[PDB]
Structure formats: structure tokens, C-alpha cells
Amino acid sequence: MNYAAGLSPYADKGKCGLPEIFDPPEELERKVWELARLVWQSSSVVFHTGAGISTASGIPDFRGPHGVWTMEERGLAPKFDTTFESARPTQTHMALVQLERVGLLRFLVSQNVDGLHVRSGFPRDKLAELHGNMFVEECAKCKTQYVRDTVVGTMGLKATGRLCTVAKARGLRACRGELRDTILDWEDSLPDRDLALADEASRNADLSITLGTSLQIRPSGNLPLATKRRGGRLVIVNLQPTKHDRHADLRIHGYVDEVMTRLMKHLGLEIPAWDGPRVLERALPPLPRPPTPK
Amino acid sequence: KQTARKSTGGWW
Ligand SMILES: Nc1ncnc2c1ncn2[C@@H]1O[C@H](COP(=O)(O)OP(=O)(O)OC[C@H]2O[C@@H](O)[C@H](O)[C@@H]2O)[C@@H](O)[C@H]1O
Ligand SMILES: [Zn+2]
Incomplete structure (x- = not known):
């Protein structure tokens, strides 16, 4: 149905429609607290986001229970609650803008094409839009x-x-x-400079955290592993399984908006409200860290 | 070394 956009009909769509898994509230509470400790104690934190962080905005994902590839594979079309123009950054989008402002995010690698990181005000010089x-x-x-x-x-x-x-x-x-x-x-080849920067940040991170990606598409899905090569840690946040679950130091199955809400709460940081589409080309210098929470 | 194309596969 996407061709149409005159796209290749020969792609391998990967594993689509796997069951979702939900951590019980207590475990999750435990995990998000552990996440905060990791984020506070690491000096270089890189985030990797995929289509799962835009689902709360009305954009479907690709391989979720109602993903665009999941539906297509079974002879159905998917459903769009929003257009790309009218989509709003989610609380996770806005949380990442704040993390970067206070120095708790070194870099952001995204697979998403929906334009929301840029439109949320996330500075382009800390962002690789690999797709x-x-x-x-x-x-x-x-x-x-x-x-x-x-x-x-x-x-x-x-x-x-x-x-x-x-x-x-x-x-x-x-x-x-x-x-x-x-x-x-x-x-298609990934853009050279976005990949080179994403690769550099991933290899140098001591914490990579994935949000809302099943990690099936390379090379972007393999970048969070680079951190493990220098003994850094990997955190995977996702409702479905991901391809690299076995390498995770911490796995959280819960809604990203909920995970990032709590994380910010433990960090002492408000999640900024969004004013409307605002392109920021280059990061401001970092605001000071909040009072040490632990 | 190894390809930089958008696809499915290993990291080794
Ligand atoms: N609110 C949510 N919270 C947590 N996880 C979520 C949420 N919503 C969806 N998810 C999970 O997010 C994951 C999204 O994975 P995919 O749909 O595979 O999307 P992504 O990993 O970004 O896809 C990579 C690439 O595949 C392509 O065809 C397209 O090029 C895309 O960039 C799914 O596993 C789904 O369970
Ligand atoms: Zn020109």
C-alpha cells in the first residue's frame, strides 16, 4: 500500500506483530529507578529512538500489533489518527529536549522520519536522522x-x-x-555524516538507551551494541521483544511516555511544554545539572 | 570492512 509512494516492494519487513509484554507496576518502578541511577552516574548517554516513541502522537509504528508492516503483511491497511503536519511531540520527545539542555544526553540517534525531534526543538547538531x-x-x-x-x-x-x-x-x-x-x-545507503556521528557517539557512550525500536534494521539497530565494546551499558525500553534483548543490562517493558515521566521525576526535571514547530540548528550550552537526587 | 545500507542483518 506504500507503493503508492513508489517505494520498493522487495523489502524484508522482518518479524511483525509479536506479543507485547508489560512489566508489573512494582518491577518497572524498580527498573525506572535503576535507569535514573544509570543516567546520573554515566558521563556519556546516547539515546536511540524508533517509531514506538511517536505512537502516543497518533503515528503508527511499523511492526507493533497494528504496525504499518504488520497490517500489510496480513492484507490490511493501517490507520493514521494524525498527519505528519499535525502530529505533536510526545512527552518522551519533550523529555529528551530537556535531558540535552541539562547535560544528561550526549547524542540522539533516530530511525524515525516523522520530523518530530526537529520540530520539538531538539538541536540538530546532537541528532542523527539515519533514515x-x-x-x-x-x-x-x-x-x-x-x-x-x-x-x-x-x-x-x-x-x-x-x-x-x-x-x-x-x-x-x-x-x-x-x-x-x-x-x-x-x-539505500545511510547518510554518511549522520551515520559517522551516530557511530562516534555510540562507540564512546558508556550508556546507550533504546526507546520504541525493535532493533531489526541495521546498521541503526546495531549501534547500541557499540557501547558494550568499551564496557558501557545497554538499556532497552520496548513493549515488544527486540532483536538484541539478550545484550541488555536492563530491559524495561512499559510505555515510553510512562517510563520517561517517572525517570524525569527521579531526576528532578520538569518536562517542557511544546510551543509549536521550532527548528533549533545548534545546541545552547548546558544548563546546570539539577540537585544530585542520590 | 562492512556495508552501510538500510536492511536486515548481523553486526559482526
Ligand atoms: N508507547 C510505546 N512504548 C514503548 N514501546 C512501544 C510503544 N509503542 C510501540 N512500541 C514498540 O516500539 C517498537 C517499534 O518497532 P518497529 O515498528 O520495528 O519500528 P522501528 O524499530 O523504529 O523500525 C525501524 C525501521 O523499520 C522500517 O521499515 C522503518 O524504516 C523504520 O525506521 C515496536 O516493537 C512496538 O512494540
Ligand atoms: Zn546544491
């Missing part, structure tokens, strides 16, 4: 990018119809390259 961003187009000639307020209008790295305006020939001519969407199709 693209429905609001971003890019010059085929010169790689310069343009962030738009509306979706760019194609997927699969196709010409959007606009042209590049960067200055060429010592100021005499415009680039005029075709702008293209940045939505990777199946088996």
Missing part, C-alpha cells in the same frame, strides 16, 4: 539541506520539484541541483 526526515530535502549536486515547515512531498530520494540556490562559480551562478527527499528506501 531521513519527511520535512527535509537535499541537493543532489552539493548535499546542502533545506528544512521545510510542510512535508517535502516524495519518499525514496526522488526529486521534489524544487532546485538548489547555493552560490557557485565564484558567485556567478546558482547550484540549481535538484532537491530530493531524504527518505531512504529499502537498501
